[PDB]
């Protein structure tokens, strides 16, 4: 009985997946990508990293087990890059980070850490979200709530439905708040707004989650750990989950990490000690290839300088490309102020296609959306601009 009467299906990420090249033709693109891509639409390897995969093929003297907390060089710049550089919060000794098989893999380690030590029973998320989010958050029974910004039409943040939809539950409760701007809505609380809700993370109670994948890829690097920081010399307890998978040409090989923080180097050596057990049951100690090629890039000024331009570029085209989609419709389409997209950050963003508009594209079209209205501006190109600009019209 691993056999009969099961049940079965689909992460709404197959959502185009294969069915995309399926039928064979000018497939615009499954704008609904899990990734960046160039004015070529190749998800490259980078260099900076390649530049280091040599360095470790050169001196990788062994390959013995790794501690269940990876490596804190990976850890210290993780640290340094989150909280930021100078904070003696860093040398307050009051946050630790283990290595973790990136993104979604650090949030689940958060979940059983959190079933224990923590007397929590839930996490309120955000509507719309990341659909693996309510899933790696159901792990320790823990059910998710849906707080509520992005109320649409001016596709812009309902501070309102939020503080409100938010304020709503219990002290011992967990919110989840991703770094800058969003999946599926490269949206956001500005400074004063981040600023606004922390006075509220505070007395209300809460305690922040903080999914931070995409970090400084959707922002110049900097408004990013402000997003977070602002909510940091403000708190007392928090849990940040990160992932270098995107921002580094790193996935495949699971990279980022989970960081615990408290007021006491006593309280955090402690909570962390149990956390180091959440892990010990999953994978027992990290996918090491990753950490290394990230500690290295990160601890090399020559190498860190190759990487940082690579990232910078990578931004160029989501700041830049984002614009494009819009003038082209300013020159065809012509049914709305598609401005939003242009300045509404990240490589993700939803649109006015009541699904049905989008079941449509797939068609004797060959456009591939995410039946939520979400497109990876990342799959949008110089070459596609055009047709994809014209796919849509007839769709309205």
Specify binding-site residues for L-aspartate.
34, 130, 183, 374
Q: Which is nearer to ligand PMP, 287 or 366 (CB)?
A: 287
What is the β-pairing status of strands 95-100 and 256-261? antiparallel
Instruction: Kindly report the backbone phi and psi dihedral angles of residue 329, in degrees, each rounded to the nearest multiple of 5, phi listed first.
Output: -70, -25
In 3D, which of 163, 200, 155, 125 has the Cα closest to residue 349? Answer: 155
Binding span for a copy of itself by CB under 8 A among 64-72, 121-129, 143-151, 350-358: 64-72
| 222 sits in which H/E element | none
Instruction: Find the shortest distance in angstroms from Cβ 55 to a copy of itself.
Output: 10
Residue 238 is classified by DSSP as E
Q: Which residues bind ligand PMP (CB under 6 A)?
A: 102-105, 130, 178, 183, 211, 213, 243, 245, 251, 256, 284
Query: Could you tell which of ligand PMP, a copy of itself, none binds residue 196, using a CB distance below 5 to 8 A set by kind?
Result: none
Q: In what helix (H) or strand (E) does residue 213 lie, and over which residues does it extend?
A: strand 211-213
Name every residue whose Cβ is closer than 8 Å to that of residue 297 and which is 6 or more positions away in sequence: 48, 49, 51, 52, 248, 303, 304, 307
Among a copy of itself, ligand PMP, none, the one that 45 touches (CB under a kind-dependent 5 to 8 A) is a copy of itself
Cβ 11 to ligand PMP, closest distance in Å? 12
Q: Residue 182, interface with a copy of itself (CB under 8 A)?
A: no
d(CA 113, CA 391): 47
| CB 276, min distance to a copy of itself, A | 8
Q: How many helices (H) and strands (E) does the chain have?
A: 13, 9
- Element holding 241 (H helix, E strand): strand 238-243
Q: Which is nearer to a copy of itself, 296 or 328 (CB)?
A: 296
Q: Which of residues 332-351 bind a copy of itself (CB under 8 A)?
A: none
130 binds, among ligand PMP, a copy of itself, none (CB under 5 to 8 A by kind): ligand PMP
Helix locations, the chain, DSSP H = 50-53, 55-58, 72-82, 104-115, 159-167, 191-204, 224-229, 265-281, 289-298, 301-330, 339-342, 356-362, 382-389
Shortest distance (Å) from residue 6 CB to a copy of itself: 5
Q: What one-character-per-residue DSSP string does 167-194 give? A: HTS-SS-EE---SSS-SS------HHHH
Q: How far is the CB of 304 from a copy of itself (least distance, A)?
A: 19
Kindly tell me which of 14 and 191 has the beta carbon lying closer to a copy of itself: 14
CA–CA gap between residue 17 and residue 370 (Å, rounded): 10
Residue 237 in the binding site for a copy of itself (CB under 8 A): yes
Q: According to CB under 8 A, which residues from 8 to 47 bind a copy of itself?
A: 8-9, 11, 34-35, 42-46
Is 186 a residue that touches a copy of itself (CB under 8 A)? no
Which of the choices a copy of itself, ligand PMP, none does residue 120 contact, using the CB cut-off of 5 to 8 A by kind? a copy of itself
Cβ neighbour number for residue 57 with a 10 Å cutoff: 8
- Asked if 3 touches a copy of itself (CB under 8 A), the answer is yes
Which phi and psi angles does 179 have, rounded to 5°?
Answer: -15, -65
Stretch that binds a copy of itself, among 185-193, 288-296, 304-312, 355-363 (CB under 8 A): 288-296
Q: How far is the CB of 198 from ligand PMP (least distance, A)?
A: 20
Partner touching 1 among ligand PMP, a copy of itself, none, CB below 5 to 8 Å by kind: a copy of itself
Q: By CB under 8 A, what part of segment 95-124 binds a copy of itself? A: 100-105, 108, 112, 114, 117-120
- Which residues fall in the annotated binding site? 34, 130, 183, 374
Shortest separation between residue 214's beta carbon and a copy of itself, angstroms: 14
Query: CA of 177: how far to CAs of 206, 231, 275, in Å?
Result: 11, 11, 21
Q: Please choose which of a copy of itself, ligand PMP, none residue 280 contacts, taking the beta carbon within 5 to 8 angstroms, the exact cut-off set by kind.
A: a copy of itself
Binding to a copy of itself by residue 251, rule CB under 8 A?
A: yes
Which residue lies nearest ligand PMP, judged by its C-beta? Answer: 103
Q: Cβ(214)–Cβ(346) under 8 Å?
A: yes
């Amino acid at each position: 009985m691993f056999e009969n009467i099961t049940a079965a299906p689909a992460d709404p990420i197959l959502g185009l997946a294969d069915l995309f090249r399926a039928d064979e033709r000018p497939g615009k693109i499954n704008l609904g990508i899990g990734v960046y891509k160039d004015e070529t639409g190749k998800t490259p390897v980078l260099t900076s990293v390649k530049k280091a995969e040599q360095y470790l093929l050169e001196n990788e003297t062994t390959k013995n087990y790794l501690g269940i907390d990876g490596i804190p060089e990976f850890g210290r710049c993780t640290q340094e890059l989150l909280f930021g550089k100078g904070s003696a919060l860093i040398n307050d000794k009051r946050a630790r980070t283990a290595q973790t098989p990136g993104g979604t893999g650090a949030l689940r380690v958060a979940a059983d850490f959190l079933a224990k030590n923590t007397s929590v029973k839930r996490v309120w998320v955000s509507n719309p979200s990341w659909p693996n989010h309510k899933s790696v958050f159901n792990s320790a029974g823990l059910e998710v709530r849906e707080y509520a910004y992005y109320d649409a039409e001016n596709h812009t943040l309902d501070f309102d439905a939020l503080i409100n939809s938010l304020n709503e539950a219990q002290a011992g409760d967990v919110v989840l708040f991703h770094g800058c701007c969003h999946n599926p809505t490269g949206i956001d609380p500005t400074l004063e707004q981040w600023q606004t809700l922390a006075q509220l993370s505070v007395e209300k109670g809460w305690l922040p989650l903080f999914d931070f994948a995409y970090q400084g890829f959707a922002r110049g690097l900097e408004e990013d750990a402000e997003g977070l920081r602002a909510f940091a010399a403000m708190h007392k307890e928090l849990i940040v989950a990160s992932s270098y998978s995107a921002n580094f040409g790193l996935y495949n090989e699971r990279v980022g990490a989970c960081t615990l923080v408290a007021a006491d180097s006593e309280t955090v050596d402690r909570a962390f000690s149990q956390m180091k057990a959440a892990i010990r049951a999953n994978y027992s100690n990290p996918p090491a290839h990753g950490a290394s090629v990230v500690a290295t890039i990160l601890s090399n000024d020559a190498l860190r300088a190759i990487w940082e331009q690579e990232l910078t570029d990578m931004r160029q085209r989501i700041q830049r490309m984002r614009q494009l989609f819009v003038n082209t419709l300013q020159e065809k389409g012509a049914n709305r102020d598609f401005s939003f997209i242009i300045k509404q950050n990240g490589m993700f963003s939803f649109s006015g296609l009541t699904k049905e508009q989008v079941l449509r594209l797939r068609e004797e079209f060959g456009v591939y959306a995410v039946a939520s209205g979400r497109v990876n501006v990342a799959g949008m190109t110089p070459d596609n601009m055009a047709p994809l600009c014209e796919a849509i019209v007839a769709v309205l």
